[PDB]
Amino acid sequence: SAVKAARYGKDNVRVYKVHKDEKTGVQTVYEMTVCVLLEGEIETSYTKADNSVIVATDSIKNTIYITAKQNPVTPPELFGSILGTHFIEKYNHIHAAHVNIVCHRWTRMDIDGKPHPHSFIRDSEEKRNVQVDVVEGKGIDIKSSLSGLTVLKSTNSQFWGFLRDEYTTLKETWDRILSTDVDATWQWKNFSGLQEVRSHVPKFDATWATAREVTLKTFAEDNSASVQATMYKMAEQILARQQLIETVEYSLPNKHYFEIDLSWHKGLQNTGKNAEVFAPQSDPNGLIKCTVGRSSLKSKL
Amino acid sequence: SAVKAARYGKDNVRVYKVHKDEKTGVQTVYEMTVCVLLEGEIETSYTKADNSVIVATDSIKNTIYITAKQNPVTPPELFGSILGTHFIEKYNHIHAAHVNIVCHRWTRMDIDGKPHPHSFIRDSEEKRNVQVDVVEGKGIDIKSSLSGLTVLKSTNSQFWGFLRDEYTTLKETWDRILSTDVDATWQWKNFSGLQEVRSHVPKFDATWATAREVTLKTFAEDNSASVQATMYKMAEQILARQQLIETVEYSLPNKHYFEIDLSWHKGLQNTGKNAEVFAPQSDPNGLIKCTVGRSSLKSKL
Amino acid sequence: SAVKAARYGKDNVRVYKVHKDEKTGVQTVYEMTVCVLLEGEIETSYTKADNSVIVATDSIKNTIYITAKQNPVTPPELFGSILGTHFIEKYNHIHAAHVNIVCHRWTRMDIDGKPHPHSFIRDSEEKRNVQVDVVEGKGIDIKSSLSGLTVLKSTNSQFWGFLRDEYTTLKETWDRILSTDVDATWQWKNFSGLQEVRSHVPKFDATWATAREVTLKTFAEDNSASVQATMYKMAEQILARQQLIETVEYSLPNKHYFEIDLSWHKGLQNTGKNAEVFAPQSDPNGLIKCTVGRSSLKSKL
Amino acid sequence: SAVKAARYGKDNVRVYKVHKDEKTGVQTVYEMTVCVLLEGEIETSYTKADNSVIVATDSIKNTIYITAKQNPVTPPELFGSILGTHFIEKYNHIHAAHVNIVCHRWTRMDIDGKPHPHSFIRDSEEKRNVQVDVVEGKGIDIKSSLSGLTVLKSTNSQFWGFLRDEYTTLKETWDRILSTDVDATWQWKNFSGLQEVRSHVPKFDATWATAREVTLKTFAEDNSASVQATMYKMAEQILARQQLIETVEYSLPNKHYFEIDLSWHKGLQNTGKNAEVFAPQSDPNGLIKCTVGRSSLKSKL
Ligand SMILES: Cn1c(=O)[nH]c2c(=O)[nH]c(=O)[nH]c21
Ligand SMILES: Cn1c(=O)[nH]c2c(=O)[nH]c(=O)[nH]c21
Ligand SMILES: Cn1c(=O)[nH]c2c(=O)[nH]c(=O)[nH]c21
Ligand SMILES: Cn1c(=O)[nH]c2c(=O)[nH]c(=O)[nH]c21
């Protein structure tokens, strides 16, 4: 046998950081969960009980906290790049660092209409994430995402014209509920190293904001022909607004809300135009995915 | 043997309702999870295989949807009262109905600064709940609550002066992080029946709002001596603002954030006044409870 | 205002203990999650910021580990009694200790047909629990339970003869799937103190075993008329086999498996006697409860 | 813009099947959760609101149940292959089907030492999984796995000789607890189609059994130098025992159990050779991965 692939490290490292402005009294908090997995010339730890090549996962954990103490933790794309760059530069034999960060929401409370200087609310379980792959000799590849953004619209969703054969029972509809949990990923142009990441720092927060704004507005305003058609519109708009992202990926469940026929009980009318009470379905669910890039076709468009 | 207690019914009944204003186009959505458990002269279903006394749980489920079609689902205190009253009035042999409702957040989206007529966001996993116990001959007992309201403050929390003995290692502190998941319950005066519940309907939304406002403002503004002292202030204020509630209960975890001594690494200073990077602790956690009522002591105050 | 009730302590304290037989090499492991909440003359911590009356929850945590080091952790009824007794005896002003223990399964592995001396498998997420309430001047009240015991039978379950009215759509059945997650609790006679608990120590493991055996055999062998009728049989048998338990409580979901009519597709027959493929339903679910004690009726039986 | 990748279908489809032997009375149950995602000439559903190319996810769901009615559901590798082959053969424009199956445990109960004909217990949340990718013109690629197999050993695990630098605080150990949740995947040689899958059917159950047996025995018996070294031994043995699998992948958390120094309290000795009571750590955790294949090196071995 032989080792074809290997990576190892520390997962589920919870990290908080506070910034305190001593002039104004305003404090700002950041909370994340971090995973760092390393690759390199480590195969003998697996094959020969050679622990000399192992940077202990406990040491990886310590390094996460030390790096957070010595650098900004925001935007996460930058923190992840700093953190991954450290491991490949510090250890000659480590040739890749794979950094995943989940950012948790701590939104400043407004009390009596004024922003509070040091009190925060978890206003959504929506996350902002990064995956930063720092590969020696091949730069820094960053995928940014928002996830767990849960939305519903009560009309202006349709689904008709789909294929019908002997496996088909679904009724066409011209007015349904649409609800989903949005997972949206934008993948950046390869960066050559930390300097180039730093040169684009403002674009990280701005592109996250754009992605979130476009998602919400498109979901709310598109009289949707399908999940497929709506998510494509989101992706194409995000690509149009940031030339440094190469692709946009969406992964959307269709979280079904079923009508309930109550006509068996006193002729109650609760379907079609009279549908008011619905049964949310926990499972099964549609799952719709696509990855959108920029076109390169010049004929047969 | 004999049956000392029994209740049975349907749990985890997911319910959505939409209201559509055909004049304005504005739609409003409600989503809940409902449990109804019945008591009564049902012991022979357990002891004698006598199913004649069982209102099938499937029928309880149907009744939940029928009741939602024929009545408002808001405030939940009212919907639960209507629903429980139905079972004890419809079935001579059913003498109590225990209705639990969890209300899920669907907050209207603002798009380009304007409220959208039919698009919503799950802006928090915070719930608004009711427990409505409708007991034949003994009225309607209602406990209202908010839960899963997760908050953090980065300073203005203290914990010193606690008992110290041979089991004590905890260091006193004059400046710590405080974070919790708020579970707050207000229990109403017994209502005689559905008419009396209806006579107080506006007070349900108003008292929920008061409870939430008081919770947030007190948490943010109290330079806290302990979880105990802060939660008591919340409770006393809520009681002062609604004479129809008899008690207020809080159940608060202390979700610890630990300092991280990094002085072993290059003399990094990350404790006390220089603490910036902390380790959120998933477990264990403090758990602090109290039930506050109005005082009846006249001497030795 | 005034404090009507209060309790506080440490929750989610994970504890492992190992026993090593140095003669045989056989090691045995125990893992639990412990909560201890205290009551007493503690109201001034809430009302007056008086922390002097607070045994810190961190100190409660330390005490859990110290008690586990100095005593057996099995049976959990004994460990909980020792632990609760400590707090009311050590602290004059603490008058009750409420100890909840969840015991996690670590079952010894058999390797090549032989029990391994130090390797274990989590063979089920089924738990064994205790709730031990140690109340100064009122002894020790113990509720023992098993929970998360998930079972299914594919036939020999029925449900017919239930009430039918204008809310009823459920079809009677003479052959259905029955599946549940068993939560079974046996409540012991009040014990006067730790000596009396110790005097009954072997009965704890034996009664847990009896409860589990009776549950499984009754579920498997009863041609069930309803969840109600089957669970009653379980309870009555457990009471007959241990005179020191006063009541037995069951709480059982009915986790529904629905037939799927496929006759719309090529006349496929998948209902009634030809039902093979079913749709497990995640929600809603029946929820059936009862508490059974010994009879005291002498007439009109 | 243009669609670079797309797949869509139905997720979280819960499926039960029963087999009834009418001669013997013995019934056997199977329960799974299935996801099927399709690829093909479907880009116009995203770009042009062309639903004609969409096989509705509801129809995919129906097809899952119909396929389970008309074929064996075991081994899952076979069921997934049948199911994926259907979609690419039935629909000219569908060119890949991606079938994920999670198999849930229903182990036959033994009652009074005899196997019960129709009663089952969920004896572990351990799963048996498959991922079957059926790609038109490129055969059938199958990855089989076991996951959620949770184990602990109380000694015969070590971790010393790891890299030590200015980021290192971890103490070397020659005797620690090791616990993990095993996720093990074996990837099969590409199969040309359903006939070739069928020709190997007995090998699926046999290789799953081998993988599980090797995992347990190696974990129990290896005096482990590291997670890395132990998991490699597992992989190499599985490869030696089934020539039709190309690689074996493990993904193992190191679920840490920390010693607790209690020497501050009455000189209690609970470290090193006297360690009995430990603190299980929920997070962070080591995460160790590798993919092992057969060697092709002929020099510098
Ligand atoms: C309702 N529904 C299905 O059954 N499949 C699909 C699909 O692919 N896309 C939808 O928007 N809805 C839907
Ligand atoms: C830190 N801490 C403990 O250890 N116990 C307690 C308590 O009862 N209350 C607190 O506010 N904090 C705290
Ligand atoms: C199917 N079903 C209901 O709908 N209610 C009930 C009940 O109370 N008990 C059952 O055993 N089954 C059942
Ligand atoms: C304890 N520990 C670390 O900190 N890293 C590692 C590792 O890579 N492998 C281990 O087996 N243990 C371990």
Residue numbers in the entry:
A (entry chain A), B (entry chain A), C (entry chain A), D (entry chain A): 1 to 301
Give verbatim lines from the article.
The archetypal cofactor-free oxidase is uricase (urate oxidase or rasburicase, UOX), a long-investigated, therapeutically important (commercialized as Elitek in the US and Fasturtec in Europe), tetrameric 133 kDa enzyme that catalyzes the O2-mediated degradation of uric acid (UA) to 5-hydroxyisourate (5-HIU). A number of oxidases and oxygenases, however, operate in a cofactor-free manner, relying on very limited chemical tools to promote and control O2 chemistry. X-ray crystallography at near-atomic resolution together with in crystallo Raman spectroscopy and QM/MM methods offer unambiguous evidence for a C5-peroxide intermediate in cofactor-free UOX catalysis.
A combination of hydrogen bonds, salt bridges, and hydrophobic interactions holds the flat MUA in place. A water molecule (W1) is held above the C4=C5 bond at a distance of 3.0 Å from the MUA plane by H-bonds with T57(Oγ1) and N254(Nδ2). An additional water molecule (W2), part of a complex solvent network, interacts with the O8 atom of the substrate. In order to define the vibrational modes responsible for the observed changes, we employed QM/MM methods at the MP2/6-31+G* level of theory. Calculations carried out for the organic species in their protein environment predict a band at 600 cm−1 (experimental 605 cm−1) for the 5-PMUA hydroperoxide (brown trace in Figure 3 c) and a band at 597 cm−1 (experimental 597 cm−1) for the MUA dianion (green). Ring distortions account for the MUA 597 cm−1 band.
